[PDB]
């Protein structure tokens, strides 16, 4: 109901609602790395059966899209994909009701503007860093010109393409946020269960779509 801030001053008024959520989801994601696969194997094991399928799926959705230079960007796909869809699990699923932070309201990392705009800016300047080495070092953002219709363009679109995927996740996290909160604000918990599975639908679907979305930006970035 309030998405603005936690009063965690750092000289320049940073939001802690991003901070603690990012910390906890990041921690669970990095700490599932050795549930049973601290000594991995060719023969798949406990955590291996989780992680390797994701890795192969990432290779599927990336090498087709990214291109010949698949390897320098295999972290880029997996981090954003796993982090975002597990954090959407934590945002639409993990409850924090009976204990409330006196400063702000915390359910999700991507709730606040800063989280998703940071991730989007990250992917887009990663596109530009890709174009740095992989395009003419004179013109990388403003290269193309047809019979002139595109004289200020090919950079005006990529000004807002970061803004594109940021707002893409903005509204979609605010979506499940509102859908979860409003029916509980209406009537006790047992009535919205028909559509809590609907709220879980897009929560589970965001994984592959954001993977192929920013991977499509990266496949554009090969050039």
């Amino acid at each position: 109901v309030g998405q603005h801030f936690y009063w965690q001053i750092g000289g320049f008024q940073i939001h802690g609602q991003v901070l603690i959520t990012s910390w906890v989801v990041i921690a669970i994601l990095l700490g599932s790395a050795a549930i049973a696969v601290r000594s991995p194997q060719t023969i798949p094991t406990g955590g291996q059966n989780f992680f390797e399928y994701v890795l192969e799926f990432i290779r599927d959705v990336s090498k087709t899209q990214i291109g010949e230079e698949y390897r320098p960007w295999v972290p880029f796909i997996g981090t954003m994909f796993l982090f975002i869809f597990v954090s959407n699990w934590s945002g639409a699923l993990l409850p924090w009701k009976i204990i409330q932070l006196p400063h702000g309201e915390l359910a999700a990392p991507t709730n606040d503007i800063n989280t998703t705009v940071a991730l989007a800016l990250l992917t887009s300047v990663a596109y530009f860093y890709a174009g740095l080495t992989k395009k003419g070092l004179g013109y990388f953002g403003k290269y193309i010109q047809p019979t002139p219709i595109l004289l200020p363009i090919n950079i005006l679109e990529d000004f807002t393409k970061p803004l594109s995927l940021s707002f893409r996740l903005f509204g979609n996290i605010l979506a499940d946020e509102l859908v979860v909160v409003v029916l509980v604000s209406l009537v006790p918990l047992v009535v919205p269960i028909p559509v809590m599975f609907l709220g879980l639908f897009t929560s589970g679907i965001q994984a592959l779509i954001f993977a192929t979305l920013a991977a499509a930006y990266i496949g554009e970035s090969l050039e």
Binding site: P40, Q41, T42, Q48, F51, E52, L55, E56, V74
Partner: protein, 56 residues
């Protein structure tokens, strides 16, 4: 995990390489198979023919 996955893929490649060494050495030895009997036997036979001519 990237190392472990490409280890899986290269293990498939290595058993394929062993089967390929098998398939190549099969051709080589099976070429040798009749050729050793041909070499020995025909070397005896034609030399016999010539020695038999000069001794006739």
């Amino acid at each position: 995990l990237g190392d472990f996955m490409d280890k899986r893929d290269a293990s498939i490649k290595e058993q394929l390489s062993g089967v390929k060494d098998t398939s190549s050495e099969v051709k080589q030895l099976e070429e040798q198979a009749n050729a050793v009997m041909r070499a020995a036997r025909a070397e005896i036979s034609a030399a016999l023919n010539k020695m038999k001519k000069e001794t006739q």
